[PDB]
Design a protein around this nucleic acid. Structure first.
Lengths: 136, 94, 38, 141
RNA sequence: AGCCAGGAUGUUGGCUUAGAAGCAGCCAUCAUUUAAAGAAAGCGUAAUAGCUCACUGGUCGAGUCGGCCUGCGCGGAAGA
């Protein structure tokens, strides 16, 4: 599980998730798993999907996780009233918008990249698509 | 070797461009050299199947606008974020 | 048979048929591949 | 031979007679005789040289048991008789386990012409060196 | 797409081969007469074997195959 090594403040406000994404082209690799839905992704979903990919295209290839969590999500325990402070940091999410290339892959044929990205897009909560490295 | 039939955009801004992409076209511009920049509207499907080739971004294109021919080169393409379609293309004269 | 909400062709003899508005997977090779309700 | 009518191919190294541990009733399930691997088969084995299994066609007729003629020496123990260690291949091609001189394969390939596919010497030369590709046997050029 | 034909040899390739002789195993994964063929893609064995196919010929006489972008729909869908 991914999590920043050392923050600056422990608890972040909710804020909103509007507009489109910045990481949009397949930059590092050759094939990409790009988001279409909005959503947000916990570190467990990123790890689950990465294991599905790494298993699927065996220890050949090279995989880039282009998103990183760095946003702490706090929850209140059970049978605790409202108020009395902000909750506790339970997990860490990345906020996703439509357009984020969530993962990249290189060093495989396209048909294995289809296969691993299908296998791993079923571990994520957002609708997802397959993209290739377009040249300009 | 590509011939891209175009028209001149009499309207511009975000209203007119988004109206122009719902009608299965997209805006574009031809700047460079000493002339004024030329706002251009392009059919979408022809240019999308055309840019699926690699030679679209390397070879000199020819754009036919008002019965002229402007030999341009595809400088920079804005693509739609999560759909296989185009927002806009910058064409530098050549 | 298997009532699932994803019905798929598990084999190359499996065959998707819609009967009475219900998607089904009829196989001839293996009857374990018989499925319903996709 | 004919349509498949009770002929199979099975035994182990035929320096001895009638292998009881390895196969046994595998040569007794069909109409193939138990006795005709013991005396007469070794009578037809001593005609060239012993110490080789024989995958053979045994067409069981309405005669006593059958009639048999051994035809070809197979290339498994012919490519194991001088190859390297006596244990086996395992993973033979990713390293250098065996090596075979190609002149003796040219003369054995020049001998064997019944149970092969080829009409030229060079056409069937590197086929048996394809069996050298099988057990990882590095040919010495 | 149907229908009529062919689809092998070293190849028991050695296996920890107790039986794997393409079939509970791993490395290999070659080369040829040949239009064409995998040391076997599916089943299958006490065990070879048994078939079909991957590919090619004939019959057939006009479309067919699979992706993409989409509109509307189907299933997923159980409560007093």
């Amino acid at each position: 599980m991914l999590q920043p090594k050392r923050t600056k403040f422990r608890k972040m406000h909710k804020g909103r998730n509007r507009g489109l994404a910045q990481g949009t082209d397949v930059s590092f690799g050759s094939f990409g798993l790009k988001a279409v839905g909005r959503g947000r992704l916990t570190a467990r979903q990123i790890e689950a999907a990465r294991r599905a990919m790494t298993r699927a295209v065996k220890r050949q290839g090279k995989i880039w996780i282009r998103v990183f969590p760095d946003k702490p999500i706090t929850e209140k325990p059970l049978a605790v009233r409202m108020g009395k402070g902000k909750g506790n940091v339970e997990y860490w999410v990345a906020l996703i918008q439509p357009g984020k290339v969530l993962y990249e892959m290189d060093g495989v044929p396209e048909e294995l990249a289809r296969e691993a990205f299908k296998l791993a897009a079923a571990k994520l909560p957002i609708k997802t698509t397959f993209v290739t490295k377009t040249v300009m | 070797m590509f011939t891209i039939n175009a028209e001149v955009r009499k309207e511009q801004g975000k209203g007119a461009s988004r109206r122009l992409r719902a009608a299965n076209k997209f805006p574009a511009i031809i700047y460079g050299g000493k002339e004024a920049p030329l706002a251009i509207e392009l059919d979408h499907d022809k240019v999308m199947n055309m840019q699926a080739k690699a030679e679209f971004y390397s070879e000199v294109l020819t754009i036919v606008v008002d019965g002229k021919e402007i030999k341009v080169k595809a400088q920079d393409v804005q693509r739609h974020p999560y759909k296989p379609k185009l927002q806009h293309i910058d064409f530098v004269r050549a | 048979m298997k009532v699932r909400a994803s019905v798929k062709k598990l084999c190359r003899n499996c065959k998707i048929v819609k009967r009475d508005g219900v998607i089904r997977v009829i196989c001839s090779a293996e009857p374990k591949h018989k499925q319903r309700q996709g | 031979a004919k349509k498949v009518q009770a002929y199979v191919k099975l035994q182990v190294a035929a320096g001895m007679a009638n292998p009881s541990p390895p196969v046994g009733p595998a040569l007794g399930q069909q109409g193939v005789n138990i006795m005709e691997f013991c005396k007469a088969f070794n009578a037809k084995t001593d005609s060239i040289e012993k110490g080789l299994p024989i995958p053979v066609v045994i067409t069981v007729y309405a005669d006593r048991s059958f009639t048999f003629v051994t035809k070809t020496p197979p290339a498994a123990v012919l490519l194991k008789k001088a190859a390297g260690i006596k244990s086996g291949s395992g993973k033979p091609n990713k390293d250098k386990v065996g090596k075979i001189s190609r002149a003796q394969l040219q003369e054995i390939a020049q001998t064997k012409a019944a149970d092969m596919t080829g009409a030229d010497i060079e056409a069937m030369t590197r086929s048996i060196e394809g069996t050298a590709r099988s057990m990882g046997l590095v040919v010495e050029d």
